[PDB]
Design a protein around this ligand. Structure first.
Ligand SMILES: Oc1ccc2c(c1)CC[C@H](c1ccccc1)[C@@H]2c1ccc(OCCN2CCCC2)cc1
Ligand SMILES: Oc1ccc2c(c1)CC[C@H](c1ccccc1)[C@@H]2c1ccc(OCCN2CCCC2)cc1
Lengths: 246, 246
């Protein structure tokens, strides 16, 4: 039961749920001139999405939702989630984006079309902002979970009784995550004022993350495959697990 | 001095700053068939922007910024600000959007191209959400001010000393607005837990507002004039006031 966790248990569950850090797939003994940067990043992102499913299923309360609802939330959120992870791992790399341990790019490497130089700079500024806030790992996992639960919660196109229950559940969990962030902050010695202030600062950054995702989606839709499985459909298949591998 | 206001003085200043509610301009004795819905809404939005300048100049701390910074924040925020106002005035109109007192549209009226039916539904859901939260007028003016100050704050493309001071000032004001929201909430009788929870719920809605603005921008850019003054430029002229009308 997600609504029964204590703050410590919420944090411990998020921390234990973290996905791995993957590597970009390229021949390191090959000229950099030769790689397609978008190809690299597309390959990486696509591998990260499988692990994002496994992560999401471990976010307390997520699998209490309907399959359809779980797909919708991921369909709305996945790009924000890739981005907040990128920005987290880039904190200790001022001026650079740590896409993977073997793929650290500066803004000059974002310029090869099109494109990214816009998104690049925005991602770097957000990384800068987290650096300046001394964002902690325990706060980061709360925020990534909040994105998962929140990004899609006002675009469910139903007001069925089931859909009211789904939303109410999501709002309860999100409330629990707010309580957890506040707890982390009191435990770190912050005054109540600084607690409310820092909570607000962190949530306000999620709106820049939304922006960045929308801008990035604009680029990705402007380059979309034709006779392909819709994302909803890829998401649904990865989420719609059997229990034969128990 | 904005940083010296009490919570009561912040609220009183925001409340006193509210823009007027304008009317759509059309011949009411003329078939509805004949109006261009986008034409109506474009005309209205453009009139509202002048008043948004006057509003913004009254948001404590805003005119302490540089002219360039004030233009940037408005350039990033203006569509979110029109939208949050729309959603506020639509609360008491379930299923309808109160663009103006003489222009209340349901989702079926959003369908005449293209387009809006997407944006329409999103705006209605946000209105629904505020209704369900019993959003208060005093909270609404805090949130609209937060959008003004926050939407553009991580896309200033400078790290000059002046630009560090600008950002620090913005963050201080935003902090003051957080304190004010918390104050409103304690004064309304909410427990501390409910205070943190409600603060987080309200700020999380700002990310849906960002989304909606981005989607709406996508539509507006897909219909842009050629030999026209850039928005930055229109904004700069309206903001770059003389003091000859004292
Ligand atoms: O950790 C990460 C790995 C890769 C990335 C990011 C984080 C941040 C956004 C990047 C981006 C750059 C330019 C334009 C848009 C986004 C890029 C990235 C590249 C490609 C992506 O998408 C490819 C399409 N793919 C098919 C279904 C799932 C997505 C996603 C993200
Ligand atoms: O209270 C309001 C008045 C009008 C509106 C809104 C709020 C919410 C967004 C609406 C919208 C509908 C469809 C697509 C996009 C947005 C529309 C609106 C229409 C047109 C707009 O922009 C016209 C361009 N104009 C030139 C410089 C300033 C903007 C803005 C908003």
């Amino acid at each position: 039961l997600a609504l029964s966790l204590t703050a410590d248990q919420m944090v411990s569950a998020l921390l234990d749920a973290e996905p791995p850090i993957l590597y970009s797939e390229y021949d390191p003994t090959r000229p950099f001139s030769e790689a397609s940067m978008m190809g690299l990043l597309t390959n990486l992102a696509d591998r990260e999405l499988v692990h994002m499913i496994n992560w999401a299923k471990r976010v307390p309360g997520f699998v209490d939702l309907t399959l359809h609802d779980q797909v919708h939330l991921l369909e709305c959120a996945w790009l924000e989630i890739l981005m907040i992870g990128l920005v987290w791992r880039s904190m200790e790399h001022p001026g650079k984006l740590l896409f993977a341990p073997n793929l650290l790019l500066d803004r000059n490497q974002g310029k090869c079309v099109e494109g990214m130089v816009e998104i690049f700079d925005m991602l770097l500024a957000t990384s800068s902002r987290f650096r300046m806030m001394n964002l902690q790992g325990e706060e980061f996992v709360c925020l990534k979970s909040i994105i998962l639960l929140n990004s899609g919660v006002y675009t469910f196109l139903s007001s069925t009784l089931k859909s009211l229950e789904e939303k109410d559940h999501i709002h309860r969990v999100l409330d629990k995550i707010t309580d957890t962030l506040i707890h982390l902050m009191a435990k770190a010695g912050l005054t109540l004022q600084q607690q409310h202030q820092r909570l607000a600062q962190l949530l306000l950054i999620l709106s820049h993350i939304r922006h960045m995702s929308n801008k990035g989606m604009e680029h990705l839709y402007s380059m979309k495959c034709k006779n392909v499985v819709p994302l909803y459909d890829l998401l649904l298949e990865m989420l719609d697990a059997h229990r034969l591998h128990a």
